[PDB]
Amino acid sequence: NVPELIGAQAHAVNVILDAETAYPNLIFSDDLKSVRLGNKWERLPDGPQRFDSCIIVLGSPSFLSGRRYWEVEVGDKTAWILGACKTSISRKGNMTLSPENGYWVVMMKENEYQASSVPPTRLLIKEPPKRVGIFVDYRVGSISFYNVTARSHIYTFASCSFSGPLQPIFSPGTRDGGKNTAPLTICPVG
């Protein structure tokens, strides 16, 4: 069974962003709970471990057991990606975001929401989420997404047959001519 949001929230965990392996134009808050895309001149220190194409950042902890829930404020942003991935994902290209490639994400783009099944599943969302909840049930092999604003279920990937560690993944999207500069912010369950 995929729980109702209130059930999922009982498994709340404390996620922080891994700034070390972030796409280098990303800007992080000091507490590592927020990330936004800066300009071409705002860059993190160079490294072979970073995403070089995808505007991606990973989260910690990686985990390989149990039930794990976290929540992210997306606000009035126009584009973003949220979900989880296998800790072995390639960071230098090599990434259609798909379950087969070890990614289970929901994305907003071009006034549309999709779960990145292949082909992607377009989601009918009547009340746009300002906060998204992500619930992993490792043993059952399910990852579920919630619209925390509406307190409604968005999508579940089931029968994921997870093996090895998983970690949270994020993208704040591109800047969208100034409409999409706000950060993603990991938030405590209220």
Structural fold of domain 5-187: Jelly Rolls (2.60.120)
Residue pair 26/44 in contact (Cβ under 8 Å)? The answer is yes
CB 56 within 8 A of CB 174: no
Residues 6+ apart with CB under 8 A from 114: 106, 107, 120, 121, 122, 123
Cα–Cα distance between 57 and 173 in angstroms, integer? Answer: 11
5 vs 122: CA distance, rounded Å: 21
Distant-in-sequence, close-in-space partners of 12: CB < 8 Å, separation ≥ 6: 69, 70, 71, 188, 189
Task: In whole angstroms, give the CA distance from residue 183 to residue 79.
Answer: 11
Place of tokens 């390989």: 64
67-92 CB burial, b ≥16 within 10 A, e <16: bbbbbbbbeebbbbbbbbbbeebebe
Long-range Cβ contact pairs of 30-33 (< 8 A, separation 24 or more)? 33/185, 33/186, 33/187
Amino acid at 38: G
**Residue 163 phi, psi (nearest 5):** -140, 140
Say if residues 135 and 168 touch (Cβ distance below 8 Å): no
Amino acid letter, residue 138: Y
Q: Is 65 helix (H, G, I), strand (E, B) or coil?
A: coil
How far is Cα 50 from Cα 157, in angstroms, rounded to an integer? 27
- Tokens 């746009």 locate to 128
Question: At residue 97, what is the residue type?
Answer: L
